[PDB]
């Protein structure tokens, strides 16, 4: 199945938690911080399903901006990147929906139906 990572009381993980539920999808509710994927797991599910690695970093408003993180991701490796996302499951997107070489980042109806179902 599905391995649906979330962390804590977000409204995000309720509606995906939710939209999985509604259409009989089957899913892995599992914490991206207690059980945050090492440099190694990432690099396969992005292999893998083609993920862009700059949108699995939490976006605009949050940390990215108060690490500035955007100043060093624009000059070192995307390895570099995948070791940022394994020292902190924060640093990840909370909302991660990934399964084999299928995936969905964030709340998108769109995604969902476009990854998910059909």
């Given at each position: ?9 977000c409204t ?103 990854t998910w179902?059909?």
């Amino acid at each position: 199945m599905i391995k649906f990572y979330q962390y804590k009381n977000c409204t995000t993980c309720k509606k995906a938690a939710k939209f999985l539920d509604e259409y009989g999808v089957s899913y892995e509710p599992i914490d991206i911080v207690q059980h945050t994927p090492t440099i190694n797991e990432f690099k396969t599910i992005i292999a893998n399903t083609g993920v862009e690695i700059n949108k699995l970093f939490n976006t605009h408003g949050a940390k990215y901006r108060e690490l500035d993180l955007k100043n060093k991701l624009q000059t070192l490796s995307d390895d570099e990147k995948l070791e940022l996302l394994s020292s902190d499951g924060m640093l990840v997107k909370r909302p991660l929906a990934v399964m084999g070489d299928k995936i969905t980042l964030g709340f998108k109806e769109d995604q969902y139906k476009e990854t998910w179902l059909a």
